[PDB]
Design an enzyme around this catalytic site. Structure first.
Site, PDB file in Angstrom:
ATOM      1  N   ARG A  48       9.870   1.751 117.442  1.00 58.55           N
ATOM      2  CA  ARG A  48      10.440   2.821 116.704  1.00 58.55           C
ATOM      3  C   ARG A  48      11.316   2.185 115.553  1.00 58.55           C
ATOM      4  NH1 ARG A  48      15.726   6.850 117.052  1.00 58.55           N
ATOM      5  NH2 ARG A  48      14.804   8.411 115.734  1.00 58.55           N
ATOM      6  N   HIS A  52      10.682   3.023 111.663  1.00 60.22           N
ATOM      7  CA  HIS A  52      11.932   3.490 110.595  1.00 60.22           C
ATOM      8  C   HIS A  52      12.139   2.864 109.385  1.00 60.22           C
ATOM      9  CE1 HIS A  52      13.645   7.251 112.876  1.00 60.22           C
ATOM     10  NE2 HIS A  52      12.571   7.262 112.658  1.00 60.22           N
ATOM     11  N   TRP A 191       6.997  11.589 127.011  1.00 62.17           N
ATOM     12  CA  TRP A 191       5.742  12.067 126.642  1.00 62.17           C
ATOM     13  C   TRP A 191       4.579  11.889 127.507  1.00 62.17           C
ATOM     14  CZ3 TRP A 191       8.594   9.696 122.856  1.00 62.17           C
ATOM     15  CH2 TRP A 191       8.906  10.203 121.748  1.00 62.17           C
TER      16      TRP A 191
END
Ligand code: HEM
Ligand code: ZNH
EC number: 1.11.1.5
Lengths: 294, 108
Positions: A48, A52, A191
């Site tokens: 992540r 980003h 998820w």
């Protein structure tokens, strides 16, 4: 004037063998500091992080991207959309002090590649050359995506990152890793069940689960299943759109096609807005900790 | 034994955080992404009723004792190749011993 040109300059007298060492120190600390976030590890926060720092790119004027390593400056560090990523940086600085020659962008992007590979994912070709730029080149907040949106947003958002339908669906499969934290983004839960091992679970769970739209404790709306999982509105939008749905279906059947497409896309994402001279070295394919006997 | 014996209290956190997203807390307990672990010790691999295991898991047919159990938790896909058990592995000996001790007591 035409956009700014970001030329990839290899760190003074460094090669594959030097970067393989940076990889190993990360991959080992990934194995050592396994207590974080109820034993998910630092694997997802690293992918992540790589996303980003590269997600700030704008194809029109070449501003942003992984090149400058600008995430170290207060402005981008404190981006409301970069919440929780400070933990990815604290994981990487002891490794930066051990290898002070490596650029910031090279490290954050290498952190993402190391994490995917170590979480039994595809082999992602990585290139060196990103060079640190100053505080005035730091991108203004809000260039990153909003989760509370639909398929029409996602398609036009990624167009700025020079990504097509097949690329964004592939890149979204990284959501098979980790969870959403209420204190960070306003959304809560994972998820999948395999939060630290790179599979096509994201696609399987999207079409195979029982999705009900509810509100969480941060008052935001998300899709929850009976299994305890979750999906963001942008995630769910992947099965709502007819074009995105036929690619989500394809990856649910074939994991090897997903692994083939992510690696193409993720590499592209981390190399977006970087010009490689023709004298620059061919992309590196790092050996995992398992491939070296650990 | 070669495996020590220690924690039923500490392995309860290791189980609830690293396994419970599948691994159940009761007999008759449901299979999910994975089987109900009740009566696992003393039983062979791939024997729990009502579940569809990969050919590789039933094929490996090893009696689950505390020792071959901790060789499986270190690396699931190296011990049983082809297993759909999506788990990275417990790289620390303390983490394995503490959990097997909880699993010996909980899966009675
Ligand atoms: C660190 C703690 C863990 C321990 C004690 C452990 C132990 C075991 C054992 C002994 C089995 C084999 C059962 C049999 O063959 O009868 C098994 C299966 C399984 N467990 Fe774990 N595991 C761990 C973590 C996890 C996690 C992270 C998940 C969640 C995704 C999980 C999911 C499963 C699944 C999916 C299977 C079924 C594999 C298959 O059918 O091929 N476990 N576990
Ligand atoms: C549209 C688009 C999009 C969106 C909106 C999103 C969103 C999101 C959110 C909201 C979150 C959470 C945060 C917290 O912590 O809480 C996440 C996470 C996330 N993410 Zn993602 N994503 C995305 C894309 C993405 C991509 C492309 C990738 C890669 C490649 C990713 C990867 C991710 C990960 C891995 C994670 C996890 C993290 C952790 O675990 O920490 N991602 N995500």
């Amino acid at each position: 004037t035409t956009p700014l040109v970001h030329v990839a300059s290899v760190e003074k007298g460094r090669s594959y063998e030097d970067f393989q060492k940076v990889y190993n120190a990360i991959a080992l600390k990934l194995r050592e500091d396994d207590e974080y976030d109820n034993y998910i590890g630092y694997g997802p926060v690293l992918v992540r992080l790589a996303w980003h720092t590269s997600g700030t790119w704008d194809k029109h004027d070449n501003t942003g991207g992984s090149y400058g390593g600008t995430y170290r400056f207060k402005k981008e560090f404190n981006d409301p959309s970069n919440a929780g990523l400070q933990n990815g940086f604290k994981f990487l600085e002891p490794i930066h002090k051990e290898f002070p020659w490596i650029s910031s962008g090279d490290l954050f992007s290498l952190g993402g590649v190391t994490a995917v590979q170590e979480m039994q994912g595809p082999k992602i070709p990585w290139r060196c050359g990103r060079v640190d730029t100053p505080e005035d080149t730091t991108p203004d907040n809000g260039r990153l995506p909003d989760a509370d949106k639909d398929a029409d947003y996602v398609r036009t958002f990624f167009q700025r990152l020079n990504m097509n339908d097949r690329e964004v669906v592939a890149l979204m499969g990284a959501h098979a890793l980790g969870k959403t934290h209420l204190k960070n983004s306003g959304y809560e839960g994972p998820w999948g069940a395999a939060n630290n091992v790179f599979t096509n679970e994201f696609y399987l769970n999207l079409l195979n689960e029982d999705w009900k739209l509810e509100k969480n404790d941060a008052n935001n709306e998300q899709w929850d299943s009976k299994s305890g999982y979750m999906m963001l509105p942008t995630d769910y939008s992947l099965i709502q759109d007819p074009k995105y749905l036929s690619i989500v279906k394809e990856y649910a059947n074939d994991q090897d096609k997903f692994f083939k497409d992510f690696s193409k896309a993720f590499e592209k994402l981390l190399e977006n807005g970087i010009t490689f001279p023709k004298d620059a070295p061919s992309p590196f394919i790092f050996k995992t900790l398992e491939e070296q006997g650990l | 034994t070669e495996f020590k014996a220690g924690s039923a209290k500490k392995g309860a956190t290791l189980f609830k955080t690293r396994c419970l997203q599948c691994h159940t807390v009761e007999k008759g307990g449901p299979h999910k992404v994975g089987p109900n672990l009740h009566g696992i010790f003393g039983r062979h691999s791939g024997q729990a009723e009502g579940y569809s295991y990969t050919d590789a898991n039933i094929k490996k047919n090893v009696l689950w004792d505390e020792n071959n159990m901790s060789e499986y938790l270190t690396n699931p896909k190296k011990y049983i190749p082809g297993t759909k058990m999506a788990s990275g592995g417990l790289k620390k000996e303390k983490d394995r011993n503490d959990l097997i001790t909880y699993l010996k007591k909980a899966c009675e």
